[PDB]
Design a protein around this ligand. Sequence first.
Ligand SMILES: [Zn+2]
Ligand SMILES: [Zn+2]
Lengths: 279, 741, 275
Amino acid sequence: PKFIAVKLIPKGPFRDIPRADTLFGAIGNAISAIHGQSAVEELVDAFVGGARISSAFPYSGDTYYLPKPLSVEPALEGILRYTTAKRLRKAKYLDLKNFELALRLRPFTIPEEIPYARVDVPRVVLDRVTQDSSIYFWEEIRFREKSGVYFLYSGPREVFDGYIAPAMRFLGDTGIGGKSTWGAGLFEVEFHEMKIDAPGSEYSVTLSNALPTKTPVLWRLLRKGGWSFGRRKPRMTFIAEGSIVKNDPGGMERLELGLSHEVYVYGLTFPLGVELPEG
Amino acid sequence: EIDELTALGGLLHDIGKPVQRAGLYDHSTQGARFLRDLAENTGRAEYELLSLFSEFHHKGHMKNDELMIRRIKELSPERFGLTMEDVLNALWIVYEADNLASGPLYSVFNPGKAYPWAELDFEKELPVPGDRSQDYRELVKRLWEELSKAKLRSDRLLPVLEKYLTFVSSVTSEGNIISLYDHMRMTSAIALAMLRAGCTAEDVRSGRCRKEKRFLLIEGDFSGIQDFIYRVSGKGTLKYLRARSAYLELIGWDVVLEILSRLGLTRANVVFNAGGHFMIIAQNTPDAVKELEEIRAKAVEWLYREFESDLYLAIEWEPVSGREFGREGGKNLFAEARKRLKHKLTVRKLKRFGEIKGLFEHGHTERLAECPVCGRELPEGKLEPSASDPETKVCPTCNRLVSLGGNLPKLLGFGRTAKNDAGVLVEGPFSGFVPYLQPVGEQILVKNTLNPGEIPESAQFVPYFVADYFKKDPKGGVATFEELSMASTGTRRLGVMKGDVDRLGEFFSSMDSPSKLATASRFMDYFFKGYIGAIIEGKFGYIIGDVPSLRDWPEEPDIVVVYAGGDAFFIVGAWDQIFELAFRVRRAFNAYTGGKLTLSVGLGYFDERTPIYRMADVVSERLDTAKDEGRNRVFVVGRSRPLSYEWNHYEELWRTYAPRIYAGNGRLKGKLESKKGLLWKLLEIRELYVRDPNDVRWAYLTAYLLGRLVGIDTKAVERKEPQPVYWVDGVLKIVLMAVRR
Amino acid sequence: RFYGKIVIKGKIKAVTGLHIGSQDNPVIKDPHTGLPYIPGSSLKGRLRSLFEILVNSRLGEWREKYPSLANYSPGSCRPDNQENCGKFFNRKINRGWIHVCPDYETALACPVCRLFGASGKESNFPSRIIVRDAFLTKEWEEKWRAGEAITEAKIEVGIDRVTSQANPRTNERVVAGAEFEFEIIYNVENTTHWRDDIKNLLTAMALLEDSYLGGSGSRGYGKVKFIFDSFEFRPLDYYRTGKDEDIVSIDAREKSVSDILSGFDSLFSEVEGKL
RNA sequence: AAAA
Ligand SMILES: [Zn+2]
Ligand SMILES: [Zn+2]
């Protein structure tokens, strides 16, 4: 487990911490604008055969968070306080050092700070003759000073070097989702390496939205849809991140949607090894 | 029938205890004279056979197996069709039921304090724990009248016995905190579970039902309620939310009643149904586990098909034996068999819809859409136009709840019927519900009362309680957020209080029998179901007394209870009558408990026309904020810091800082009028403290501004706790919001 | 298609106090630090409103350059409450009336919605500028760390016309003289439209020099002032290879009136040689 | 999610 880590140093507020389903859609729309139609299909074939990306997770100044495995909920008592056991079950994102602890079913600590805030700003709509207003509210993810968001990449390097690294320079100047004409999804991209110490077992947590091909072990269900060139995507049951499959490669699904081209929904897994309890 | 004679015999065998404390007539023969005397007049010989269960329990007369025989020949088993085998078996079964269910009413919270005797009507005399042989005589007289009048059907006696025997202790001993109602309720529950398991008197005498996995705990729990009831956009009235909180209650009671009516059980088996989380006791036969699995697989599919992965019911069961209802050694066996089921609940909540098996497939129908009130997914139509604004399409089960929110005050109950009938408003997973206006079905749920009036003697009575105080509008219905925000002191806002009992699972994991758990769960239930509306009526001021109040408490306050349940509530209303109500409910929960349990409250003051998902996620976040700090707190108002308060801390502040600046009913003191700017600019001097707590400039500026709080103390700087200028935001800011802003 | 992205950078100078508000009236501020900022929507919609009024004046004189302004009469649709009956401000969002075109192929020829974006039904022409959010220049964070006041508190009053009774309120205004740092990213989607789009965007900016930006503007709370640093073209090949191919025009000391005529024949001669 |  040596992964490339893409860091998205934010220039403004995001609309949401991007799922893998809206990272892959953004990459496909970048590739279709800087390369062409016939190079999105080679991207899709590279992700079918090889590579996988994960969801975006928050970072805050050289500490990188990863989602909590669901493998710790059924045997959180055997790890061990009732206040600690409850706060240790509520929490969503573990630190990289703790996350590698909890993959082996060891006692771990939750971070005492979230790297962003869901704030809703009031906006207004004024008619041009009478300046007569109308409020609506708008939610967004407002980050701290050194904090931001990142995701991980496995697979070969010519796919990263020909597809994902140009896609990230394109999407820095047209954002990842949301009101990107208000300067919302925009960022500066920079790449590092991350290494993850992971136990080699039969079970794997998925760091991206799964959409499985068989029933997993422990899961946390997540309906979402999308919007593809104006057309509404039907709601799909992804598995949320941090969920335990065994040997389940996931699967992308092609949609119809009445367009000039097929629309793939990225339903692949991102496996890290995990140690389970007896169930 | 033996299967109802057993439950009635286990329900009327310790009825000889109030007639013996009264001193009318050996504790059992002097309790069987009651049933024997009642059997002749106003009734039949039905009551005559039920004196066997009082003569022959507690090891007083069931010796040698012959004194039963002359008396049971002296009565007629053939007139009721019972066998000499059957009723002689039912005596032993009721005896072991009482055995392995058992082991002034002292309070379950502080066992050092007792209860005065009362009836249970939620309209007078809040049973605060405190510190006569004729009051029992009046109890027995008024019980004799009711036991004369009522039907002998066991859904007709369980409303009677908890009117009267709730605050009566079962065994008169020191520190006994088990009600007599609940002792007899659980004795009957275990008796019918032994009979439906099929065990008999030779297994009773030979010591076989104990130490054999023969009982079955069923426990079920709703997951995802906060995204079911409060994920609602700006379309959707208050009456719509107040119909969401009574549609989830109807789903829950529907599932419980099919488990009872399909497993052949009575309502004595339900240990509790508080909070969307029920627990019942059942038999362990292999032709019952199959029925439970059918109930689970049908309820879960109706939940998936109706509310797509939004609400979920996690039903599990666990085989126990009779020896695990009590205490063996210093090892708690009921609280270990209950942690073996909580793990199955927890690991079943992580397989969130595994019963469906078509859940992860993609084969979608064409041309979906989305309701604007709740975000659903309805294909190419089936959206029905609303009757509020007929231009906007909504899903049909939002129309079914707008039309139910219209019929909230007019409602005496519900009738639970087969799903495709007339009058059916809303559907449960197994039944349709038709409201019971100003008498249809086989099962009539009747709210907030214990007396069946218009109900057929062929229908099942199920009494349920719901805290449903509301300010009524100029019409006869429910107020909206607009009428609530208008009628408040100060400016126009809306005060939305959540807030629940802290660390209660540790409290319920300490009970070492079901008879004790049933009492503790019923009292914690009845505080929020019943004794929270009696507060908002304006009672119990002898116990409540001094509270932070902006105005004299009105005759008819404007507060709408959205939910009030097992430990929590969610209450809206006039945003500066909600403020007095939070501290008033705290001061009454301190008194209802012995002081042993606490509650947190997150508060929010919203503009009246605000979406309800955000209006709920502000208060639900401020409850976690006021809860992870100290678990005895109150989030009084939003505040800035470098956030909540303790209760007694605020009520010690408000004795001091408030009565020197605030006169009453939204008016400041004399000569501090025309000095309103003195109250805001002090919050400027309060805000040089959050900018730097280390700079000491805020002392002489207060001394200057009061010359035109003032001094520091190392009592704060002994451990770096914040200064007294920091504990004045939530005391000045209320008085500013409720005087002319 | 796509041919590159023109990035316009510079500074805003709040010459008079700047007030936006956050629902005794606060100004909007970053929830973590606490400094103010100018939103991207509050800047973009003010630019769009100014250019809407300018276009509504010129629905007779631009019908040959821009078609589909022939489908509109100058006015508004508030009295006759049918949307897109034929007046210019044709769409009603909630209670107010905006000109937003109803289709793609009618908004490709309307100069407002070609640049600022339309919504329609089944169609949705997205925008073509990104008005990036504007934060204080690091000089004005250093002045914020010197303890200096970055906002003020201005007390105003209303006065009875006969008896001269004071009725005061307070507004929280940004200190006059402040500096924010803006960015506007235009997306070159069609190589014909680029000259007219950047000329219309600079026209919309120059109406904002003589108008205001949020808050009580006619009581003296606007007077924004654009101080450009540089433009960049960022071509299609730049996002492919990541070298330095982007033309950097330099206009470090130029105003938006000195930029529309002085540089448009001259500082864009290099960009028209690459299209 | 501290039995909503
Ligand atoms: Zn709906
Ligand atoms: Zn247009």
